[PDB]
Amino acid sequence: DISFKSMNKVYGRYSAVFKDSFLRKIGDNFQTVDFTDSRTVDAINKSVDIFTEGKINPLLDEPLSPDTSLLAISAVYFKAKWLMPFEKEFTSDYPFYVSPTEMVDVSMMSMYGEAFNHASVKESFGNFSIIELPYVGDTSMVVILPDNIDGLESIEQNLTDTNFKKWSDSMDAMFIDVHIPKFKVTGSYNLVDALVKLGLTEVFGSTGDYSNMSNSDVSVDAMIHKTYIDVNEEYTEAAAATSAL
């Protein structure tokens, strides 16, 4: 996209016979592989490593089951300079209230006297402010900060795509001083339990019906998401990858 790039790859076991309808929907992102060969996982991991500029590596941290029938992966990568970078000179140690009476040191970036898109939002599930920090190009970071020192959970659990658009649309340019942490975080998530709790009860394991993939039984037992973000004075860099197999 210029700041954001994405790819998907699908790997099917060479000994299975695939259905052309499925293959057509997947496009030219498909290849067959031998899951009994150890360098197979090495080559998939290297692909994702290179695409994510080293930030997701390895995606697959377990040897693959030699009985795998299909592995589906996605990877995404983002890096952009702030439109207005923070001055390191202003970065300094601040208390972060992880809870209202527990303070943990953070490196806080600060920018004074500039104008940003901003709104003050009043809701039944909590009052908050929202600001937009633009990147060079056509992306931005939008930050949602509760007015009450431990007010996030009720706002979080009312965050929907529609709400978010509504609040973002209400922002207008205002002079405001901004203080936000510099941070790096890596995540790794087992998506099966969350998706089951959301209603995907016949997707993972034996109840999953993927009979439209091939002439053989395909099961999907696991789904992992691995992520990386670095927020600093000059840029944000972010990457993620997802695997179902």
Binding site: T139, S140, M141, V142, D177, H179
Partner: protein, 31 residues
């Protein structure tokens, strides 16, 4: 002087302007 001081848990979204959400996170604690 108005202040935006993210010194307690917050949510952050990376998005395409006028477009889709690319990444979404919760900052709960310094790592």
């Amino acid at each position: 002087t108005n202040e935006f001081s993210a010194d307690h848990p917050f949510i952050y979204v990376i998005r395409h302007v006028d477009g889709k959400i690319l990444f979404v996170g919760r900052y709960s604690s310094p790592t």
